[PDB]
């Protein structure tokens, strides 16, 4: 792909984070804390899952960013509507305003309804995410495997501003403490 030149500088929005997340001072890294992080509750925070949004809102154009997932067992990545539900249980699906992929129990899947099996020969250490707002496209690239395509959502009905979306995942196993990091341009 040749999407690298639409690179955007993404930062994380503390105020949207689940109350167990620790966002670095530069707002470029997030990890699961071992306890509630001593913050007040607010209506923006994801209550049920270890999720956080980027600060940037996109309503036009072409945007690209990269996320480091080294040594994690579980995570979700992509984009979502600014108006997604924050409280209670919900599924990651385009019907609920999410365009995502994930790793879960040694398999990669796209957040369609129902979910779609991905075919990845080289486990990725970094993921590239491309959004073309006007075309209605969200694509995912395997940076570890020379930028190979992982998945394309097409005919997307965004129906609002989009925000970068992140889930660091739970750490029941002790093998999923590693952070998500936004990679430099
Ligand atoms: C409702 N949420 C977000 C929540 N409550 O407890 C927990 C812990 C569950 C085991 N691992 C650390 C997090 N998460």
| Pocket perturbation via mutation, ligand 1, pick of 20, 33, 177 by most ligand atoms within 8 A of CB | 20
Cα(111) to ligand 1 centroid in Å equals 22
Contact assessment for residue 113 and residue 51, using Cβ atoms and an 8 Å cutoff: no
- Cα torsion at 31, 138, 145, 118 (round to 10°)? 90
Q: Residue 76 pairs with which residues in a beta bridge?
A: 102, 167
CA 132 – ligand 1 centroid, Å:
35
What is the resolution of the experimental data for this entry, in Å? 1.4
For the chain, how big is the Rg over CA atoms in Å? 15
- Please state the φ and ψ torsions of residue 139, each to the nearest 5 degrees: -120, 150
* Ligand 1 environment, Cβ below 6 A: 18, 20, 48, 170-171
Of all protein residues, the one whose alpha carbon is nearest to atom 13 of ligand 1 is 170
d(CA 112, ligand 1 centre) in Å:
25
For every residue of the chain, DSSP letters joined together read ---GGGB----B-GGGS-TTEEE-TTSSEEEE-SS--S----TTS-SSSSEEEBS--BSSSEEEEEEE-TT-S-EEEEEEETT---SS----SGGGTEEEEEEETTEEEE--SS-EE---SS--SEEEEEEETTTTEEEEEEGGGTTEEEEEE-S----S-EEEEEE----SSSS--PPEEEPP-
CA 132 to CA 69: how far, in whole Å?
23
- Per-residue burial over 6-20, b = 16 or more CB atoms within 10 Å of its CB, e = otherwise: eeeebebbbebbbbb
- Domain 4-182 is classified in which CATH homologous superfamily? SPRY domain (2.60.120.920)
In the chain, where are the structural domains located?
A: 4-182
Closest-CA residue, ligand 1 atom 3, reads 48
Choosing from 31, 48, 170, 175 the residue with most ligand 1 atoms within 8 A of its CB, the one to mutate for a pocket test is: 170
CB 136 within 8 A of CB 156: yes
- Strands across the sheet containing 98-104: 51-53, 162-167, 75-81, 98-104, 107-110, 116-117
Q: Are 34 and 63 in contact (CB under 8 A)?
A: no
CA 12 from chain centre, in angstroms, equals 11
184 C-alpha to center of ligand 1: Å? 30
Task: Please check whether residue 103 is in contact with residue 138, taking contact to mean a CB–CB distance below 8 angstroms.
Answer: no
């Amino acid at each position: 792909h040749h999407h690298h030149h639409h690179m955007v500088h993404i930062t994380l929005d503390r105020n949207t984070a689940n109350s167990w997340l620790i966002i670095s001072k530069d707002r470029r890294q997030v990890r699961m804390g071992d306890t509630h992080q001593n913050v007040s509750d607010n209506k923006e925070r994801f209550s049920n899952y270890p999720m956080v949004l980027g600060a940037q809102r996109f309503s036009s154009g072409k945007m690209y960013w990269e996320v480091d997932v080294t040594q994690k067992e579980a995570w979700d990545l992509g984009v979502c509507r600014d108006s997604v539900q924050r409280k209670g249980q919900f599924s990651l699906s385009p019907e609920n305003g999410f365009w995502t992929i994930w790793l879960w129990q040694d398999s990669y899947e796209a957040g369609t309804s129902p979910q779609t099996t991905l075919h990845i020969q080289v486990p990725p250490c970094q993921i590239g995410i491309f959004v073309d707002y006007e075309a209605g496209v969200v694509s995912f690239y395997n940076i570890t495997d020379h930028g190979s395509l992982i998945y394309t959502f097409s005919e997307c009905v965004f129906a609002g501003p989009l925000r970068p979306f992140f889930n660091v995942g739970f750490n029941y196993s002790g093998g999923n403490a590693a952070p998500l990091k936004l990679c430099p341009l």
